[PDB]
Amino acid sequence: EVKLVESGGGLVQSGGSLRLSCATSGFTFTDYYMSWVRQPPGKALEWLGFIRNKANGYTTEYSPSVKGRFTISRDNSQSILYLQMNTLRAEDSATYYCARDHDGYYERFSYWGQGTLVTVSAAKTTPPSVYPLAPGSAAQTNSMVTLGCLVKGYFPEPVTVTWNSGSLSSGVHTFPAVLQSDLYTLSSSVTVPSSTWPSETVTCNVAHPASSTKVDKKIVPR
Amino acid sequence: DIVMSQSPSSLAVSAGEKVTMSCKSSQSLLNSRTRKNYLAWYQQKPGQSPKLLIYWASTRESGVPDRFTGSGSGTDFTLTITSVQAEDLAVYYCKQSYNLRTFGGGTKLEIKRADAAPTVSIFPPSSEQLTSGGASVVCFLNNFYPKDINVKWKIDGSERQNGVLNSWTDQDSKDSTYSMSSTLTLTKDEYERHNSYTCEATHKTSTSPIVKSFNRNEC
Ligand SMILES: O=C(O)[C@@]1(O)C[C@@H](O)[C@@H](O)[C@@H]([C@H](O)CO)O1
Ligand SMILES: [Mg+2]
Ligand SMILES: [Zn+2]
Numbered sequence: 001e002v003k004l005v006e007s008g009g010g011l012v013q014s015g016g017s018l019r020l021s022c023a024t025s026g027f028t029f030t031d032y033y034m035s036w037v038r039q040p041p042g043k044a045l046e047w048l049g050f051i052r053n054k055a056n057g058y059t060t061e062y063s064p065s066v067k068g069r070f071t072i073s074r075d076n077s078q079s080i081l082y083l084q085m086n087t088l089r090a091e092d093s094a095t096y097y098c099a100r101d102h103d104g105y106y107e108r109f110s111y112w113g114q115g116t117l118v119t120v121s122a123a124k125t126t127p128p129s130v131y132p133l134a135p136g137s138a139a140q141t142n143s144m145v146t147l148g149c150l151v152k153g154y155f156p157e158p159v160t161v162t163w164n165s166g167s168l169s170s171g172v173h174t175f176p177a178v179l180q181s182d183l184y185t186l187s188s189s190v191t192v193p194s195s196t197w198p199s200e201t202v203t204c205n206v207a208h209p210a211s212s213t214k215v216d217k218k219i220v221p222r
Numbered sequence: 223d224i225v226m227s228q229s230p231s232s233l234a235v236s237a238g239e240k241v242t243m244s245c246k247s248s249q250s251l252l253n254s255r256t257r258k259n260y261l262a263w264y265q266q267k268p269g270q271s272p273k274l275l276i277y278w279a280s281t282r283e284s285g286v287p288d289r290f291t292g293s294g295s296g297t298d299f300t301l302t303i304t305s306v307q308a309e310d311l312a313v314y315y316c317k318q319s320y321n322l323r324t325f326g327g328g329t330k331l332e333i334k335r336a337d338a339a340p341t342v343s344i345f346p347p348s349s350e351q352l353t354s355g356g357a358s359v360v361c362f363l364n365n366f367y368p369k370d371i372n373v374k375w376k377i378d379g380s381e382r383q384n385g386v387l388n389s390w391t392d393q394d395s396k397d398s399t400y401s402m403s404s405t406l407t408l409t410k411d412e413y414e415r416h417n418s419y420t421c422e423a424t425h426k427t428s429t430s431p432i433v434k435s436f437n438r439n440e441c
Binding site: 035037044045046047050061063097102106107108109110111112113114115129131132133134135136137138146148150152173174175176177178180185186187189191 | 258260262264266271272273274277278283315317319322323324325326327328341343344345346347348350351354358360362364387388389390391392401402403405434436440441
């Protein structure tokens with residue numbers, strides 16, 4: 001299997017520097033150009049630069065938008081791709097992707113990483129408060145029951161939420177975070193048969209990488 | 223100097239129907255040496271990375287369904303989707319690689335489906351939140367269509383608008399519905415001055431609002 005995995009994203013202040021890495025496997029790394037592409041939240045993809053393959057001396061090119069400020073490199077022993085960013089500004093806040101590029105024959109980006117989120121801001125890292133969402137003395141018995149978790153007051157993005165360590169997958173909605181007085185809040189709902197809860201356990205697993213927060217919140221009745 | 227532009231910015235299509243979208247380059251992408259157009263299409267589903275669909279304008283990548291077809295040449299390209307499926311919900315980007323690389327601005331494809339009423343659930347503040355002085359009340363409005371919806375919060379029968387935040391999900395990849403969360407935040411002191419908390423949803427699927435409520439005395 002081909003694998004590309006970005007790492008290194010997180011919070012940085014304006015004017016700072018930050019280096020992203022992209023670990024690859026499942027293909028002959030040296031045969032391929034590699035590109036970095038970024039995407040501000042809810043905006044379009046922007047190509048940033050590439051580094052060529054061994055046949056082309058591993059030379060680099062950049063978009064005018066970052067040339068002279070961003071530098072791309074590669075570790076050909078370990079098949080890792082790098083992106084060094086300097087003098088960062090708000091406009092640089094985005095999800096950064098690495099992508100496999102040209103091989104000398106095909107014109108395509110065959111594979112993309114999952115992306116790493118960079119946030120440029122002066123605000124401080126704040127861990128989330130995670131609160132269970134259980135029905136009050138409501139109808140409850142409707143063949144189904146909807147539970148949730150409120151993930152409140154964190155910074156920066158992102159957070160991850162799963163249910164029953166991913167075991168509950170269908171019937172889950174996670175609502176996009178909203179920014180308020182410098183803090184994000186989101187919620188997640190999960191829907192299951194009420195014969196199964198609270199007969200069986202339902203727990204939301206929340207992680208906030210910026211603060212290395214890991215939370216398991218069991219949803220308890222009453 | 224290769225400007226890429228796409229059209230439309232967005233549209234919606236019902237399942238089973240055809241989708242047509244356009245991509246223009248400020249200069250020809252046809253490479254004279256290889257006689258191919260250096261133009262690729264990518265699909266970015268909600269919450270996912272982009273995925274290669276078509277390259278060399280018309281070559282369909284292995285593992286990509288036949289209903290996706292790229293066409294065009296020179297400065298003008300088209301991606302056609304026949305028999306659209308719910309899962310095709312995505313933003314579609316075109317990208318030139320004739321001179322370095324440049325992406326178009328994307329086309330957002332929404333799926334049209336039959337109107338559906340929301341399923342509404344209300345949740346009182348947890349004891350763990352109240353302990354620290356705050357009180358959030360949450361309402362889920364799940365699996366409805368179309369996206370437009372109104373939520374009102376009433377406390378002891380009176381509407382309250384301040385301290386309310388709303389968030390819609392992206393359309394669902396399987397049932398083409400939306401969901402939305404409405405969260406009302408109060409201080410503990412103010413939460414404890416009132417008894418009834420109500421979230422009312424008005425959606426075009428009924429002239430009757432769907433009302434969910436809880437009373438603090440009953441907690
Ligand atoms: O600049 C290049 O290294 C490259 O080979 C990249 C290719 O994608 C392609 O753009 C090519 C041009 O067609 C020139 O041959 O240049
Ligand atoms: Mg749904
Ligand atoms: Zn050069």
